[PDB]
Design a protein around this nucleic acid. Structure first.
Ligand SMILES: [Mg+2]
Ligand SMILES: [Mg+2]
Ligand SMILES: [Mg+2]
Ligand SMILES: [Mg+2]
Ligand SMILES: [Mg+2]
Ligand SMILES: [Mg+2]
Ligand SMILES: [Mg+2]
Ligand SMILES: [Mg+2]
Ligand SMILES: [Mg+2]
Ligand SMILES: [Mg+2]
Ligand SMILES: [Mg+2]
Ligand SMILES: [Mg+2]
Ligand SMILES: [Mg+2]
Ligand SMILES: [Mg+2]
Ligand SMILES: [Mg+2]
Ligand SMILES: [Mg+2]
Ligand SMILES: [Mg+2]
Ligand SMILES: [Mg+2]
Ligand SMILES: [Mg+2]
Ligand SMILES: [Mg+2]
Ligand SMILES: [Mg+2]
Ligand SMILES: [Mg+2]
Ligand SMILES: [Mg+2]
Lengths: 149, 70
RNA sequence: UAAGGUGAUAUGAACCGUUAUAACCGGCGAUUUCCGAAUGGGGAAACCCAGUGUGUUUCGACACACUAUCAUUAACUGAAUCCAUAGGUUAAUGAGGCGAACCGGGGGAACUGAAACAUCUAAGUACCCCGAGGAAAAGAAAUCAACCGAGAUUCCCCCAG
RNA sequence: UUUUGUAUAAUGGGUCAGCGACUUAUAUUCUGUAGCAAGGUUAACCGAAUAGGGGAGCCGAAGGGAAACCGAGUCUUAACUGGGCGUUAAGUUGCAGGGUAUAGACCCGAAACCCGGUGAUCUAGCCAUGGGCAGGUUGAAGGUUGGGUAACACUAACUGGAGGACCGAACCGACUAAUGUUGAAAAAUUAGCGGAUGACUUGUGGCUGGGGGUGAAAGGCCAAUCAAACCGGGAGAUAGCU
RNA sequence: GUUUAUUAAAAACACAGCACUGUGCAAACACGAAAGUGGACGUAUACGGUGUGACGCCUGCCCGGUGCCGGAAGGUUAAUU
RNA sequence: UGAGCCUUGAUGGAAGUGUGGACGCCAGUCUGCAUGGCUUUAAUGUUUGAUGUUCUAACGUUGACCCGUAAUCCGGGUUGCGGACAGUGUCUGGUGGGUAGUUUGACUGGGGCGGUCU
RNA sequence: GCUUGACUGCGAGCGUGACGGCGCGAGCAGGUGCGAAAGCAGGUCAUAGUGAUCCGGUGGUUCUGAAUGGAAGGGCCAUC
């Protein structure tokens, strides 16, 4: 009554039940050819290097993609004009590119897949709020300002 | 007779009734086979109960690491 | 070691020896047909038949020599199925069978007694089977003791009929 | 010898010579005898071996009570009485003997039970492969032809050749009588008798093993042995019997 | 036709025929601790067991008892928990 | 389909017209549903016992085919059929002259039958 | 009529048995009933109405209780 499937199969367990399981059922089916399981010490802990190394992301991996709002906040005033004209309007398009690409001042690069703005940005020019939407675990903030030319 | 893993028995014994019967008992154990070894592939050892229950706590290898060498 | 000596039932014949290789005794060897675990195959035991090698060779023959079965290991080969195994060959080791008792172990009676007979006894005896030694077996406390202590096993005398 | 009782015509012995039955071990208890004495005595073992050493231990000098316990007393009972058992009985250790105990237990003897082997060269079945059956008789099925039927059945002859068929040698078997009965013979001889192409008979070899086999069945046969073979063993079974 | 080899050859055993009953094949059944073998290289017109014993005319009544076959609702009931 | 824990239920968003199940001392209330302005006891979760369904994957195969192999054995493999059955081990109720070990008294004008054993 | 002597603990000394055992019994101790009292009562007029041992069951008792305290179990007494 102790096994470690990890490859759930209609059984009341997934990722390998570490608690009381079925018995005699694996002796000739589950274990053989199916999914070996012997939840006996040795085999048990051996699942750690397979699972205990997935949650470490909340510290290790996150740290490599969480400092977003930190890495980019005091950012140089993004001065990417959007063609200010039309007796008080504009011509430039404000959406994804101009917003994300508004960082390659020195040369850095990003992607237009992390943005937080439900409504499409109005074609104004004022302090364009750009709350970077990298991961759900971490957010950030950016700005954009249109100019005349 | 077999039960390989563990010894066996087949040891005699007098079966009494009400007071006594100078008879005899003996043949015991079980049998079965076809044990899929995670390694290459299954040979059918003729173990029995207690013998089969042994391959549990143990392995399927150690339990054979004897029937082989030794 | 030695003057005698060639085993015995009977000499006898033909002989060997007396100084130190005649005997005779002891040690190490050489040889040692056929059967018999018998082992090349077979077989009503001391017989029958073959394969592959040898030299002497008028160079056909001769006899000789090796060829059983298992187990361990080594190498080479190797199916259904890529693989890998199963299997096959070879070779080096080793075993095999006898053996009086004691010894360990597996199996295990009945007559008999109980003044009958089932429990019980005879007795784990008889016997059968396997194994090993020169002895075997057992053996350094999950022993005993009783608030004191002893201190592996084994065998002897008491405890006790 | 056995019996109330035997010359008994009840048992045993032809005779002689040799052999033939109360032993032995340890334990226990008496008797005699010896040693020592309220003490006697060691066992194994050591050994300068029958010494000497060794007193572990056994027995006796205290008993009563189921016992705790008490103690020349003690149980009994509520009893301090009486009553039961004890209390100025010398034991102990050898040696020899009487008896007993455990043993084969004075000696001889069963019918049997159990264990392990040897036996199907006899015999009972069965398997494989070979052999035998002089002679004479009857004469089925089938068929040919004539007849006959619309066609068949039916029929008559001739051919044909069957059959656990007939008679009868070999061969196989045994119903009767005589003889034999210390035989010629541990089942036969003589004169008859039954089967004799069949569930037949026979040579050679093989296969069934003892509580087992085989059996046209008698408990028959399984090597002159069978309501459980022969050989060895448990075994000196047991024998309130002779 | 067979039988008590060695006191019984028969009215006894066998027999062909009949009946009951079991067996679906890895058959029932038997030998065997088992493997395996016979049954049978057969397969229900087959094989086994029991009784009767050519053939002819037949084979009556009883299922209370015992045995066997079916049912199995209810009562009693083992190990086991 | 029972039974355990116990989870939601009936005793101990705002009126009116109705429907179903509840039960009766009965003349009745309970209880879900439109428009309208703790235990007595049920359901789902489950735990475990029952029968019955189906599956494959232990297990069987005296079916076929492939090798070992110019085998009827055996083993491995593929495949088919059967299937947690069958069958085996331990335990347990039957039945059990198939077999085995035994018992089945004595007195007595022989013994037996009858009768009697204090 | 009144009652529980169909009592408890012992028993001089006898009778009868191979033995196991069986029977008779005055008297003594503690407490009873009946009688005013002497006294009588330890079952029925007497003689048949019975079963040894083992294995246990029930109640009582600090008899014992395997290191010790308990306990189980054993003894003892009563009884089935
Ligand atoms: Mg040879
Ligand atoms: Mg040979
Ligand atoms: Mg006796
Ligand atoms: Mg007389
Ligand atoms: Mg005379
Ligand atoms: Mg004489
Ligand atoms: Mg006195
Ligand atoms: Mg004839
Ligand atoms: Mg004649
Ligand atoms: Mg004739
Ligand atoms: Mg012959
Ligand atoms: Mg004979
Ligand atoms: Mg004897
Ligand atoms: Mg004798
Ligand atoms: Mg005749
Ligand atoms: Mg005769
Ligand atoms: Mg005759
Ligand atoms: Mg008849
Ligand atoms: Mg009739
Ligand atoms: Mg009998
Ligand atoms: Mg007997
Ligand atoms: Mg008599
Ligand atoms: Mg009277």
């Amino acid at each position: 009554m102790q096994v470690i499937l990890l490859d759930k199969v209609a059984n009341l367990g997934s990722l390998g039940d570490q608690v009381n399981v079925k018995a005699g059922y694996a002796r000739n089916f589950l274990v053989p050819q199916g999914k070996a399981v012997p939840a006996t010490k040795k085999n048990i802990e051996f699942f750690e290097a397979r699972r205990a190394e997935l949650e470490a992301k909340l510290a290790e991996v996150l740290a490599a993609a969480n400092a977003r709002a930190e890495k980019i906040n005091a950012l140089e005033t993004v001065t990417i004009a959007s063609k200010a004209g039309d007796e008080g309007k504009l011509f430039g398009s404000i959406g994804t590119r101009d917003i994300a690409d508004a960082v390659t001042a020195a040369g850095v690069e990003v992607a237009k897949s992390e943005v937080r703005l439900p409504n499409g940005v109005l074609r104004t020019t004022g302090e364009h709020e750009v709350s970077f939407q990298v991961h759900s675990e971490v957010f950030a903030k950016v700005i954009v300002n249109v100019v005349a030319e | 007779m077999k039960k390989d893993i563990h010894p066996k028995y087949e040891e005699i014994t007098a079966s009494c009734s009400c007071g006594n019967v100078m008879k005899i008992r003996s043949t015991v154990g079980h049998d079965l086979n076809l044990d899929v070894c995670s390694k290459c592939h299954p040979f059918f050892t003729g173990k029995q109960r207690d013998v089969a229950t042994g391959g549990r706590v143990d392995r399927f290898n150690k339990r054979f690491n004897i029937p082989g060498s030794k």
